[PDB]
Amino acid sequence: DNKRLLILGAGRGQLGLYKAAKELGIHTIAGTMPNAHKPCLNLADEISYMDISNPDEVEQKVKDLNLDGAATCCLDTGIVSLARICDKENLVGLNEEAAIMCGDKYKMKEAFKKYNVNTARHFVVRNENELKNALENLKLPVIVKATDLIYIAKKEEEAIDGFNETMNLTKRDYCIVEEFIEGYEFGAQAFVYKNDVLFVMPHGDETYMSHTAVPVGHYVPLDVKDDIIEKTKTEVKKAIKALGLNNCAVNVDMILKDNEVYIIELTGRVGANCLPELVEINYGIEYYKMIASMAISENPLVFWSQKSKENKAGLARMIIETEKSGILKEILNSNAKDDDIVEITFFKEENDEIKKFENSNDCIGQIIVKEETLDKCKDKLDVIINNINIILK
Template identity: 40%
Template sequence: MTKIMILGAGIYQVPLIETAKKMGLYTIVVSIPGNYPGFALADKVYYENTVDEDKILAIAKKERIKGIVTAGTDVCMKTVGRVCDAMGLNGLSYEASKVAVDKMLMKSRYEEYGVRTARFRQVSFDDTDIKKTVQELEFPLIFKSVDSSGSRGIIRVDSFEEFDSAIQYVRENTRKDYFLVEEFIEGEEFGAQAFAYDGNVSFILPHGDYVYQGDTGVPIGHYAPYNLSEEVIEDAKMQLRRAVKAMGLDNCAINADFILKNGKTYVLEIGGRCGATCLAELVSIYYGFDYYEKILRTALDEDPDFSFKKPRTPNASHLLMSPKDGVIKSIENLNGPNDNICDVQFDYEPGDKVHKFHVGPDRIGHIITKGETLEAAQELLFKAMDNIKIEVE
């Protein structure tokens, strides 16, 4: 039986595991111990840290896997690259994975290859005069951990008085002795999902983002198609292709974060895996194929066949969140049967503890809708959300 290794057992790896099972693959799931839903679905589980490259490589060789993948997280991307290189598997290279998980390397490559991005500086935690180091940058600024995933270790800074607390926050969310400071670009945040296969970018799907405004913007939902002029879309695609080349990404899904300012696309960062927050589902619904299956087939060195035969289907998604820390008292879905409500998922049950929303992992579920038009999909999304009652006390 063909063996596939999936790194991570969390909510964003579950659809990958389920799809692999449907394809008849033997699933080997690796994650640290915890209450993760993917464990129950796997054919075999290894309770190991997915950032332990040597350990995971040893397991991969022992099991003679034919492919290795993850979804929705950057944490283990270097491990994916290491195993792919060492075993001759199809997927992200180790060199590309190192760039994809280090925002400083990424930004340096962007600068080298002419990718439009915010001005930045590398700053050491031991720097005795950080104000001087970043003096050429204009407020507001963003302080970033270069090796964290999602929105962790990222904070907006509007004045010198905020430096000390911001530096401390970043220090708590990194394993490096340096961090990134870049100018905060005031503009419209959006993203794109894409796929690099056999030296080419197979598709690029720009999407709009619903953003939660905390210390920084945190995506809490997405929609496609995104209403942009053809000129802006072509500019975004050009910047993405340049970034993919700069990073050396190939045979992997791509998750891109952009800012649109004055009609020009600035690249925030790009990951060598599919996005979280229902983005793989957005691609699947929009194009009419199972995106998780395409990811798995690529990892197994099979032709993923990105031909698009069906009409494009507008769709929208949104996380379900709690406004406070507490325990779920009740969950009620008052939505009736509706073919255009694609999925309503709850990650927790009554009696479970949940956190006030700050970052993506604080989600307590999601909802996905579609429609003949984007407006119809979005209207249904928010009506359906109003019909979901979650009481937290």
Template identity: 35%
Template sequence: MGLYAAAHRMGLVTIAAGLDGDYPGLAVADEKCFVNITRPAEVVAAAKSLNIDAVVTSCMDTGVEALGAVNDALGFRGISQEVARSSFDKVLQKRALLDAGVPVADCVISKGEPRDLDEAEVRLGYPLVLKKRHSQSSNGVFVVNDRLQAESVLEREFRDEDEFLIEEYLQGDEFGAQACVVDGDIRFVMLHGDLLFQSHAPIPVGHFCPVNLTEDRAEIARDAAIKAIRASDFDNCAVNMDFKMSGNEVRVMELTGRAGANGLPELVGMNYGIDYYESIIRVALGLPVTFSDSDAPNATLAKMILPDRDGTLSAVSLKPIDPQVFEVQAFRSAGSHVNRYESANDCIGQVSVMGESVEFCEALADRQAASSFLIQ
């Protein structure tokens, strides 16, 4: 929704590309183009029939390859189809990062042969992390603690996978980074902490700055981010990255050529004093962009609002309770049925705040959520 709002403020006409359905973007776009964004050729054919100047997305991987295909076909600025495909393919990406010497989790690239699990047991040991080749965020990621559990998950979830990853399980804190590449220049790398919901794999439900790292480790992470971005050939796009701090070592977990989700564009906006959605559009159009964190707040935080029970959303208020509340968004309207949080589809809103410390920000965000959303 942020991209549509920014585009309209810029006086641009927006065309929503996607399947017909109850999707928020369709309600606010100037025009609609019903197309399956998981099929690049179909999207390219549709784009060629329209008088468009750029194509953008954010916060999800689903349409990134199609976006790259349109960029290639119409000569637009932005990620290419080949680079997009690699960033959405965990096997191709792992190979590229390993070849470039980027610090990553050790792994076995498996074709589903029993000997691959044998090798992982001996070389990596349990617990192990099984990752599907094509999956977004924590979907398709499974932590297994022994052979019996591994074989059960492989039989249930990986029967149709031609290749997948069996990774070492890294103990340590997860964190991330946002970056933006413009004409080969990495304009910024913003490290951030992650707020996680524990499920079969940790699910990010919010983010904050500054990340809890020493300056030495933060510098190592920034250097690893730059190396990974170069290895991935990203250009004229936003970049979303996941890391893990394992002991004294920073490991890159994955990266994609689009802005992160769950409040990350708002987090970038608060720290750089910009509308990051507008910046993403400006990069795609070849317009100048500026990033400066010289006036960044001491701390910033954005988190999703997660229902703690099933019920009815009886009241919704977007009124800030404090001047340091940056933004409140509602994903559901009053009267809607809500489910206790189990996946991203259950989120009912988002709140973004700033303040003197991360602890202050989290408390303020919780108070704002309680004021904005009433469940009965």
């Protein structure tokens, strides 16, 4: 090809886009900080040292990089900086006003009321009278929270008790009273090109509770009625347009309550934790190639037109340790070669520390499988893990 793509970020979770760009014949430039993932840097042709979370620094550093496009994936760290790169170097991608709107819940929820997108509605209250005014356009239960540094409220007596406790602790003169939506949490992937949403793919979200709920697995297909699947397609398409997202892969956090779905979060980049790999399994496509080709002002539809007519099930899980800590000797994988095993990769090596799982950086590795159904995936996955031995010495 002979085309230059700057990829913002070079962590272990971003080597798929570096690999795809190489397979396409693209000259990659790793936009990163001194210490990053070595296999990404060994895939990258160039390295440009930059803080990708600083849109102003980034804008300066790209003028002399001779780029054809720019891309980010699996993280929000450099999502605004990408948007500015595209707005100033006139490269294909999301625009900065859309990236800001996604990033700011007040601005996002303002667009969703205007464009009538299902979401947990909120009011920026300043007094006991504004609380009750806000409560007439809000369904209970509600959360009372501060913006600078939560109080769940089932009934009115817990709401004032919450507002008074919040306003004394916060440094601001205001509070946020927001609808508390409790229900089935899930996500979705989407892709927008020239203002046409190619798809909306709902997906399951497996999690591990320690401090917060850590994402530890994803799967397709989501076990819901087809009416929930179509309701998700509807709200995501509405949200994409409410916020003005375009020429980007999209990652969404949904919630299902009483046969109605709501958008919690929406970002103009692909999701992490093997979600691009589950898009690839589910449609039988090359989705990092669609991302990379779009970035460099080429047509992603070349790859979308080779999709399968069937939807295979996929399951991706992080390998974690929950009742053991130590220094690693070796990881024993006694599993046989199988085309239904998409990936088995380990992140730790001899003399690395195995930390009793608390956050995402404590993952030992990851497994990806595909099969006719999710029950066959899960059974296949249980056999894999049971043939994975982590030795501490």
